[PDB]
Amino acid sequence: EIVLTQSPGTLSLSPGERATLSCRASQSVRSSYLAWYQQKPGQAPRLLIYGASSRATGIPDRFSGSGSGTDFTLTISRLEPEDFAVYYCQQYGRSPWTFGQGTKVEIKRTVAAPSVFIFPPSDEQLKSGTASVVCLLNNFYPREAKVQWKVDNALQSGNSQESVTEQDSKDSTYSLSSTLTLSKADYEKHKVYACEVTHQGLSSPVTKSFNRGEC
Amino acid sequence: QMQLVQSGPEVKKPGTSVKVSCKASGFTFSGSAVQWVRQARGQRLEWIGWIVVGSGNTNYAQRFQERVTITRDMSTSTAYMELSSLRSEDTAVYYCAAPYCSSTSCRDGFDIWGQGTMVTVSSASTKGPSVFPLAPSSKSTSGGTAALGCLVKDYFPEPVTVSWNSGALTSGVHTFPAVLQSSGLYSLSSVVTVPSSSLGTQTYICNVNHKPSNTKVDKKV
Amino acid sequence: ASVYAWNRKRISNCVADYSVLYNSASFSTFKCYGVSPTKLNDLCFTNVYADSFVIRGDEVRQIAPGQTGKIADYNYKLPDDFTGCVIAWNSNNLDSKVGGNYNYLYRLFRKSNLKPFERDISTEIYQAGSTPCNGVEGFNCYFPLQSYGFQPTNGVGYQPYRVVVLSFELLHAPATVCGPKKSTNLVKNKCVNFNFNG
């Protein structure tokens, strides 16, 4: 019954500058009834501001909510390098209580270093009758990263999933572990294997390849 | 101390039913209220409903308007959430939250949150893991920095703990998130970046541990 | 009435036949504080107030001076120097019917504890938070009355009971509310030891 859009989708402040996340309501709400939480990866969210203006217990002095009649904003006075996480709005109108889309603030200061790597299917796996190929783009930046898969010099359709890491502390960079698997006979069908990436700092894909019977 | 102690993880089946409980301790539970929320692995949060501990009045979301029943026990200070006609597309983590309310007056926000229980629902029974090598391609990858790793494929259920050289090799390790296959079994890869001069010199072994099957597998890469 | 509106009928102007009613063959509980239950016929008072309500059998034990719980805190608190009797008997034959009985209410929330013998019948929305409820029902704005789930096929624990509390009060009064005086037939023409009316 109440819609809580949350923009901007993501934010990139080096730790310490002054930030604002924003959520909005399309109906009537009692201004003390919208609260903010942050959730670190793997943990339950903690209460930060209730009443849209009152800090809960233990929260730093550095934050303060704004909370208009239906126009809501949480001022960040600074990022203390912990605070890079997601945040959520939640309303208590007599209608069903909803949650926002969730906004994530990422850390920058990360040299984009995408090294495209390959790992051929093993011998006992081919024995097993299925196929798996691994393509690892390590220690790269930013979140934008797309990899397509070159086979037979034409694009093949589905049959590939994705898995990415969250920002490691030191390098701040990302890594994607994309596995392209295949069937049995069609694995013994095509000769040319590849994985290629389109990147912001890497304009030209490596498009690394190898052959059947050679590695 | 203000806290909730919540239930344990479970594995459930399509068409079954589950009941989750979380106890309250450290505050006057007789006057507070409890709401239940669920969240998939990295999605927008989802609200279920809430119940007043004292009266017992409830409230449910329109999606779950019919197939959820929330109960409570005043005697032992425990709240139960029951899900009926469960399906495989509800695998998520369930949190129960309640405000700190102590006998005089109490907060307008849900301060206390449980640790959350993960409820897993798959037709796959108990697969067990299988480690595999990632041949460091000495033709191209054995230059400066070189990477090898292990492939943990088709295991059920989570989690699998992977470490290298019995915990000695910790820098440069990348444990990747588990992936759910269409077969119902989980899968993740663990790689490591090492100097090419020591890729052949030092032997690299990964210790893949899957507690549900108690499987301990080491593999030469 | 519901226990939150306990009814006070000032019984008086009449012969106080207590030890007459005593053996009604129905009373589960009959506790008399400060006066002998079988000699109450001889110990008589100025005014007797019969405070009647209906509670569930698990809650009767709270109805005693100095007791604590839910009934004695937010519905009806007996005085700590109470001198009187308490009467209660099972009444499930009457006050429950198929489908339940939801015409009985009892207060569930209150800011401050009832001072002994205080009646409160407000319908205001209880505010357990820190913001004005401004006459608006919702979170932190609760209605204070919860009904009773009276069903004839429960156990005795939730099974309805009727309760009457006779509060014997005594002032500097002629105290007409007293039990019957027995009489013996007239025997004449013998040296007897009489006691006529006075």
The C-alpha torsion from A34 through A38 and A42 to A44, rounded to 10°, is -40
Rounded Cα distance between C158 and C55, Å, is: 9
Rounded Cα distance between B159 and A118, Å, is: 26
Q: What is the CA radius of gyration of chain B?
A: 23
Cα separation of the two ends of chain B? 49
Q: Which residues of B touch A143 (CB under 8 A)?
A: none
With an 8 Å Cβ cutoff, are A92 and C138 in contact?
A: yes
Q: Which of A197, B141, A154 minimizes the C-alpha distance to A207?
A: A197
Rounded Cα distance between C85 and C63, Å, is: 11
Rounded Cα distance between B161 and C56, Å, is: 57
Residues 6+ apart with CB under 8 A from B219: B131, B132, B133, B150, B205, B206, B208
Reported for A195-198, long-range contacts at CB under 8 A and 24+ positions apart, including other chains, are: A195/A116, A195/A118, A195/A133, A195/A135, A195/A147, A195/A148, A195/A149, A195/A150, A196/A116, A196/A147, A196/A148, A196/A149, A196/A150, A197/A114, A197/A116, A197/A137, A197/A145, A197/A146, A197/A147, A197/A148, A198/A146, A198/A147, A198/A148
Domain's final residue, options A70, A105, A140: A105
Rounded Cα distance between C83 and C114, Å, is: 19
Query: Residue written as tokens 């790992």?
Result: A119
Question: Residue B72 domain-assigned?
Answer: yes
Cα separation of the two ends of chain A? 59
Question: Residue B111 domain-assigned?
Answer: yes
Closest partner CB to B55 (pick from C108, C129, C130) = C108
Query: Residue written as tokens 């100097």?
Result: B195
With an 8 Å Cβ cutoff, are B45 and A99 in contact?
A: yes
Residues 6+ apart with CB under 8 A from C182: none
Q: Which of A18, A75, A14 minimizes the C-alpha distance to A48?
A: A75
Neighbours of chain A (3+ CB pairs under 8 A): B, C
Question: How many structural domains compose chain B?
Answer: 2
Neighbours of chain B (3+ CB pairs under 8 A): A, C
Sheet hosting strand B78-83, strand order edge to edge: B3-6, B18-25, B78-83, B68-73
B6 touches chain A (CB under 8 A): no
Bond before A142 cis per omega within 30 degrees? yes
Rounded Cα distance between A21 and A8, Å, is: 7
Residues 6+ apart with CB under 8 A from C74: C107, C108, C109, C110, C113, C114
Q: Are B104 and B146 found together in one domain?
A: no
Would strands B46-52 and B33-39 be described as parallel, antiparallel, or unpaired?
antiparallel
Phi-psi category of residue C74: left, alpha or beta, with phi > 0 → left and psi -120 to 50 → alpha: alpha
Q: Which residues of B touch C139 (CB under 8 A)?
A: 33, 108
C139 touches chain A (CB under 8 A): yes
Q: Which of A52, A30, A143, A45 minimizes the C-alpha distance to B44?
A: A45
Question: Residue B197 domain-assigned?
Answer: yes
Q: Which of C107, C138, C99, C79 minimizes the C-alpha distance to C4?
A: C107
- DSSP letter at C190 equals S
Residue type, C96: S
With an 8 Å Cβ cutoff, are C108 and B54 in contact?
A: yes
A75, β-bridge pairs: A20, A64
Question: Residue B164 domain-assigned?
Answer: yes
Q: Which residue range is the domain that position B116 belongs to?
A: 3-121
Q: Are B16 and B93 found together in one domain?
A: yes
Bond before B157 cis per omega within 30 degrees? yes
Domain's final residue, options A46, A71, A105: A105
Question: Residue B189 domain-assigned?
Answer: yes
Contact criterion met (CB below 8 Å) for B53 and B79: yes
Residue of B nearest to C139 (CA): B108
- DSSP letter at A126 equals H
- DSSP letter at A167 equals P
Rounded Cα distance between B112 and B3, Å, is: 6
Rounded Cα distance between A79 and A157, Å, is: 43
With an 8 Å Cβ cutoff, are A92 and C137 in contact?
A: no
Q: Which residues of C touch A33 (CB under 8 A)?
A: 139
Q: Which residue range is the domain that position A196 belongs to?
A: 115-211
Query: Residue written as tokens 């210790």?
Result: B207
Contact criterion met (CB below 8 Å) for B78 and B21: yes
3-state secondary structure of A128: helix
Q: Are B117 and B138 found together in one domain?
A: no
Rounded Cα distance between B151 and B219, Å, is: 10
Q: Which of B4, B3, B17 minimizes the C-alpha distance to B119?
A: B17
Deposited resolution, Å: 3.9
Q: Could you tell me how far CA A119 lies from the centroid of its own chain?
A: 25
Rounded Cα distance between C118 and C112, Å, is: 12
Q: Are B140 and B175 found together in one domain?
A: yes
Domain's final residue, options A105, A132, A162: A105
Question: Residue B117 domain-assigned?
Answer: yes
Q: Are B110 and B137 found together in one domain?
A: no
Specify the experimental method.
cryo-EM
Question: Residue A110 domain-assigned?
Answer: no
Write phi, then psi, for A4 (nearest 5 degrees): -120, 85
Burial of B161 (0-12, 13-18, 19+ CB in 10 A): exposed
Residue type, C109: F
Residues 6+ apart with CB under 8 A from B33: B50, B51, B52, B53, B98, B99, C139
Question: Residue B85 domain-assigned?
Answer: yes
Q: Which residues of A138-164 are buried (b: 16+ CB within 10 A; e: fewer)?
A: bbbbbeebebebbbeeeeeeeebeebe
* SS3 per-residue string spanning chain B: CCEEEECCCEEECCCCCEEEEEEEECCCCCCCEEEEEEECCCCCCEEEEEEECCCCCEEECCCCCCCEEEEEECCCCEEEEEECCCCHHHCEEEEEEECCECCCCECCCCCEECCCEEEEECCCCCCCCCCCECCCCCCCCCCCEEEEEEEEEEECCCCEEEEEHHHCECCCEEECCCEECCCCCEEEEEEEEEEHHHHCCCCCEEEEEECCCCEEEEEEC
Chain B: closest CA distance from residue C25 (Å): 35
Token pair belonging to A140: 């790269």
CATH code where residue B45 lies: 2.60.40.10
With an 8 Å Cβ cutoff, are C139 and B33 in contact?
A: yes
- DSSP letter at C18 equals H
Q: Which residues of C touch A94 (CB under 8 A)?
A: 136-138
Other CB atoms within a 10 A radius of the CB of residue B203 amount to 9
Q: Which residues of B touch A50 (CB under 8 A)?
A: 107-109, 111
Token pair belonging to C150: 């009276």
Q: Are B63 and B113 found together in one domain?
A: yes
Token pair belonging to B54: 């004292």
Rounded Cα distance between C188 and B185, Å, is: 112
